[PDB]
Amino acid sequence: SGLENIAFNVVNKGSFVGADGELPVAASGDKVFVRDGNTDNLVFVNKTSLPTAIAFELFAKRKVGLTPPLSILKNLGVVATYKFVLWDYEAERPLTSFTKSVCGYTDFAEDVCTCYDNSIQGSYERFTLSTNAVLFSATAVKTGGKSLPAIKLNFGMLNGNAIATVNIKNINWFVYVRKDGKPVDHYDGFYTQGRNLQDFLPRSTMEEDFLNMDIGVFIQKYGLEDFNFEHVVYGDVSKTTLGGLHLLISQVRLSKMGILKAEEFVAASDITLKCCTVTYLNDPSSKTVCTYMDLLLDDFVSVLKSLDLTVVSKVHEVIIDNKPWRWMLWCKDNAVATFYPQ
Amino acid sequence: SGLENIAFNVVNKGSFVGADGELPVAASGDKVFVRDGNTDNLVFVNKTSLPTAIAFELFAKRKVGLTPPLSILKNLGVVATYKFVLWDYEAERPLTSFTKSVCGYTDFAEDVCTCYDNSIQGSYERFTLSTNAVLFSATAVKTGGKSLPAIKLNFGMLNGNAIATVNIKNINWFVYVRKDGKPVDHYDGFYTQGRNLQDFLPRSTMEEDFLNMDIGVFIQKYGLEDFNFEHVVYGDVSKTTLGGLHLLISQVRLSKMGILKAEEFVAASDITLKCCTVTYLNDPSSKTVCTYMDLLLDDFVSVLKSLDLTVVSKVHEVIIDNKPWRWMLWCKDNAVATFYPQ
Amino acid sequence: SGLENIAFNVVNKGSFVGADGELPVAASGDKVFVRDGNTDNLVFVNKTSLPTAIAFELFAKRKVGLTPPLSILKNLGVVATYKFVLWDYEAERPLTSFTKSVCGYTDFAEDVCTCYDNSIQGSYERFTLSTNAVLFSATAVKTGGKSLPAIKLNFGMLNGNAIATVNIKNINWFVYVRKDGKPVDHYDGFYTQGRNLQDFLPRSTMEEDFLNMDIGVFIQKYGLEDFNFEHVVYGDVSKTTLGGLHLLISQVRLSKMGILKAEEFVAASDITLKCCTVTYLNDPSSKTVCTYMDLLLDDFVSVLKSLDLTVVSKVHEVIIDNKPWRWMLWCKDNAVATFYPQ
Amino acid sequence: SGLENIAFNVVNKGSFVGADGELPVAASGDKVFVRDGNTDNLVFVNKTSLPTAIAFELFAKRKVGLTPPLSILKNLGVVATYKFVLWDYEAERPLTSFTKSVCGYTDFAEDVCTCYDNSIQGSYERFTLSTNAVLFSATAVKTGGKSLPAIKLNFGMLNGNAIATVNIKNINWFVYVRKDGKPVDHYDGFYTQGRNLQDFLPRSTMEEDFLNMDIGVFIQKYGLEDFNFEHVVYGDVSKTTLGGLHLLISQVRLSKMGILKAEEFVAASDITLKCCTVTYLNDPSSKTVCTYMDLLLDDFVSVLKSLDLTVVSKVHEVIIDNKPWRWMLWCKDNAVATFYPQ
Amino acid sequence: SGLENIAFNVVNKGSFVGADGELPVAASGDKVFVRDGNTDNLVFVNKTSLPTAIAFELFAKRKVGLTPPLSILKNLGVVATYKFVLWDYEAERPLTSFTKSVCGYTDFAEDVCTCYDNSIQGSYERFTLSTNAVLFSATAVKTGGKSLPAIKLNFGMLNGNAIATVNIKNINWFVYVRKDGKPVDHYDGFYTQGRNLQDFLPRSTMEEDFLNMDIGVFIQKYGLEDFNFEHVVYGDVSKTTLGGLHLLISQVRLSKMGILKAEEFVAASDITLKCCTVTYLNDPSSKTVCTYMDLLLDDFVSVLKSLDLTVVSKVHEVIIDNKPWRWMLWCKDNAVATFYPQ
């Protein structure tokens, strides 16, 4: 019921909930203001390529609180969301430029891979009829008494903050794909965790141990002697060009030791393969193009312990967030020399 | 009911009429667009200091078709309009920055000189109760069987075009003032006509005659020999500095003779005293600060024929659009030498 | 003496002090630049709805160093400041859109509730003549009686940073109201402290103890057993929906235990009742609409210890920053169940 | 004395004249507004790449009224103007991005080819000392009866309008060059007239005759039979590709016959060689790249009657506005076939 | 090869490296977006006074990784960089508005003081021929074993992060000046270190000691009793006006003790003399205009121990970053009272 009503919701409920009320609002350049008697309050700054009042609407209509991770949805070719929007809080930007039944300006009429939120009346039915589509759900989906083959997540986001099953608290997402007119049989692979350098929290004993233990002690405990962990995960800050360092957790640990900067090529929370320029001040070291992923450390190790250490170079395909990724492996004398994506 | 509904009205009815329907719209910088399937149509360009979507709303809510002239309303200290807006089509801009019960963003809560349109349910009643306010009406206003003292206009505007009573067609506006808590007794003076150089049409036989006749013939016919009409109204293009030329109609006539440019200091259709830089190409002449008014030529003459030609210099006060204006008169040998405003 | 002079002051003294000198300046979009020979330095970014050069001037003319808290001024209906501006450093914005004798573009000629700074020549006189106005000063007004009912503040701001009387350092503001033509008799209630989550420093032994002590120990020491402090102030992070948490200090303590995000609905330092979306990562918990105020913990307690624990539900009115606020109280078996604003 | 004072001058005197007074002004995007109590009036729209308040200042400080033609000044490599600005009314833009002693933001400290206005105290002295510089003056500059020789113009501009010596009215400019540390000996060539298609007026009997006479009659009278005037100047509208048409006056004549559009490649009034896409509706014909110059028809003809009609192709150099221009000449059987610039 | 190719490089390599590939890009306001199928990703936000696509190009063409400190280059009057740009990461802005052979829009044709990067083919040759120019190099420039003498730096920047020779890691820059047509003989003075308050790391045992030791212990160890170190460097937070505090390291130490804010007057990383408004919350104290420099503590001390403590006031000239700086010295009874720049 108009921008004045949406402003009322955003100011009083932090998002559009369908509350009654109006505030005077005007977009002006990339800013949204609300007239508060004798003062104009800034309530929104547009970092999208959309018109400001539009970006503001979509932000107000984002799914608030508990949300599914973004990169998987992006990876499944999601083009538009149905009756909600998913906000990338890191890039400041909806998941895509397109919606369905959200906003006239951005609505995308053509049949296309659409993402449905099971918590919303009728989205399941529209999803099942589709040739290509994705469904997510706080719970599983069935027909029979027995269910539907599924992507099962034991972590998620909360108002754009990374959260995990953790005192005993269950964080679950069920994500379903239909493609070329039929359910996808099965879902392989690992899932990126969606954490960031500043707010990183460990989600496994092995991760706890990586951050807390001495190097030799951690390597011994988990039997990693043939994987050049000191290079590949710990990072080698001994030359001016910083070696390896290819997980998020690598940065986390090293920044406990000293001052570490990581400058992301393109700010985003809906991407699997990440990349930054990384600088370590204390023992001056940097790597201009530092690829990395936030893989659960257990999963990464599990990948290492399935590699052939006898070849000199192979390219291995790892399935992460539902997509094959090319990881280069250099070996030497039955130990890993380097292991990196691309 | 939201910008999408207002866009629907503007695109299909040229203004907001309360039609049902929605078009996707977004302001972007100083432009308004409507999404037309695969194309964005530009429907509005903002030349106001207001936020673009706001300026667009107020424009959509302007009084359309037959309107009262603007400069009188401005001159009566009008601060806000009640339940409509008056659009200055020349400046591209509402009459003031303020409304009442039109638009949250621009609404002005405090009691102030408000302008009411009698065609709108309830505006008369609110007007009568006010300490300061203005009312306009297609017809007169009474209590008794006998009426209300009034500003009576026999001309007006039509979608921002100047129109006059003229085959037999009546153009009337009745404008009423209440000030310091009571009706204004009486209304003196003349009214500017609101025409422009390009679209000027004569409204009297004398005006017809000014444009059509020879100079000597026109002067003789109307007995203007002691008023330096050749200088004051016809304009003297014989030196590089163009003399006199102090009515709109002066420009109109001279531009029939040759190429005349008139560059307004500040574009506006709600101002009484006008001013431009005027250039005549054929017999190169110009006047940097050329004051002028669009007075009915009869009224101007009537003012001349009430001046004392015996003084060397007096400043005369003329009442135009309800305001005293200072007109300088230099006389010499019982004829006018110069007569100009300021 | 023009924008060039104001730029000179801002660049060399961080504000307009009346220093002589000039620097080439241009606003461009929402930015202000200074030509430094071969380089344009960005000196200001406009987050207000005012034109950029104008927002820049008012920022340059803000009261620098020691300043009174803002929300009380806003609460006393202050519309404009006389010969200075109060900068909200959090919103990046003058206190209101209007000044008096500061800047032409923003000056507000009409008689209205004006705020005067006693340190400025003549402000007290103008204040005393006013029908509605507020006065603030480092010292209190005296006259045998003698003082003049003033909301004696023992804390303040300092370049937008919260500071308190604290080694022995006095921070005082005296704030006077005239309303409907006469001094306000008396001033009741408590005052918000204006601290933020990141910079929070305790101001009382009780506050020191809330941050440092165990829960049971703190509750016992202050006899809070019947006030559900574990829910109302400590916060309950045990479900996905985070319970209670209704003071700034609540967030402060919880962020010492783990990673706590607090996303303000509208950034401002001139508002009394605050509100955010709050997320706790370590034991995943969040509250979408989390009302809170930064009350002195002693005062809040004092409020608790004046409630009737025998009713099931009452709405209590508490006076904070000179305004009645509705606080909801659910009781159960003579102990507080919930106590929150609205 | 500040933008407020400059706004006062522009609104009341149409330019900066040094009048006392202030109006609240604010640039906002590419627009400048003045607060007129309850209304923001648009007084300037920026079409320059300068910041808006700056472009507004330079416009206010332009030379008003009688001005020298622009393209010659541009051709003499003028980089900055001393204590004034020259406004290109067509492109809406100062002659260059640079001034000296006009505006801090655009001032150009380095010694460079500067243009001086003899009407301005001290400009002649600074000009004479310079290594490279241009001087213009409405009076010849002297020496001892005799003179530093000059570019002598018998035409000029008036508030951006083309004007000529013409009842008996003298329009003169005297333009002087110093280059590589010494007066320029002498000045050859012709000068473009600076007219436009809409406001074109003839400046010679030959020009009068070209517009008014029949083609054969005009050609015979002036003995033009061997110059393909019907193609080169009249233009050939007989095919879909419109032939020749290489003078302003060519367009002028043709637009008297029917509807002619001429879309300039780059709007400017400071350029000698012009170019447009030209379309004739009545007998559908167009030329995408139509080069032309506004040469005095007598001068153009004078150039024709100094060509060798015996060669098949030569490139001739013509001096126009103090610069050599390459004109291509195709001849056939001792008559011109084509004659065009480039 | 076009903005699309530059976007490809920035998104995939974090800068322009000459990689092949294209991404659709568009600047819009002060933002640059890349079309990623169904989504527009924000890749750059313009904080410069240049047009956005241009600022974006210069950023992509910055020197990446190991770079020379900026303020010295600025101090040597550098106007343009040859075939690279130096990015000020703090102000978000090239070092100047000008380049040579980088970008057409910002290229500066005229001979002027140019900076050359020895790592770039042909820059040394162009540098040597120049009348005024600067050259930097990670290797000393030679002559016959010996050398054109240089500004020798044992510290530098790394992707905008301050770094020093430091396990054993050499950070060197060699900076050479030519002026008035000939090598500069010799280079006196000290060099600012380019650190910031947040990322400050000590570069000397004395610096280590200043941060870690007690005040008396530090002063005694280094024999500083006659230099009012407690005021001049430690700072005096005991009054509401915070005394002395004239080094970066002063802030660093104090912010270890409690909450210290330092608001820079103009954000920059290319300036020697710094200045801010500094506020200490815990013991409320602030200094509006707080001048400071990040000098190696050893160098500052070295300057102190070369002062005459017998005068009451002298102004001392100190050479820092190749420039004389006026430092005021007040003495009293053969001990320093105050010592500050300006």
Curated annotation (Swiss-Prot), chains A, B, C, D, E:
Highest taxon of the lineage: Viruses
Domain Nsp15 N-terminal oligomerization, chain residue ranges per copy: 2-62
Annotated ranges, domain NendoU: 201-341
Subcellular location: Host cytoplasm, Host perinuclear region
Location of the active site: 231, 246, 287
Reported cofactor(s): Mn(2+)
Domain AV-Nsp11N/CoV-Nsp15M: start-end pairs: 63-184
Catalytic activity as recorded in UniProt: uridylyl-uridylyl-ribonucleotide-RNA = a 3'-end uridylyl-2',3'-cyclophospho-uridine-RNA + a 5'-end dephospho-ribonucleoside-RNA
Details of cofactor binding: Likely affects Nsp15 binding to RNA.
Function: Plays a role in viral transcription/replication and prevents the simultaneous activation of host cell dsRNA sensors, such as MDA5/IFIH1, OAS, and PKR. Acts by degrading the 5'-polyuridines generated during replication of the poly(A) region of viral genomic and subgenomic RNAs. Catalyzes a two-step reaction in which a 2'3'-cyclic phosphate (2'3'-cP) is first generated by 2'-O transesterification, which is then hydrolyzed to a 3'-phosphate (3'-P). If not degraded, poly(U) RNA would hybridize with poly(A) RNA tails and activate host dsRNA sensors.
Protein name, per record: Uridylate-specific endoribonuclease
Lineage: Viruses, Riboviria, Orthornavirae, Pisuviricota, Pisoniviricetes
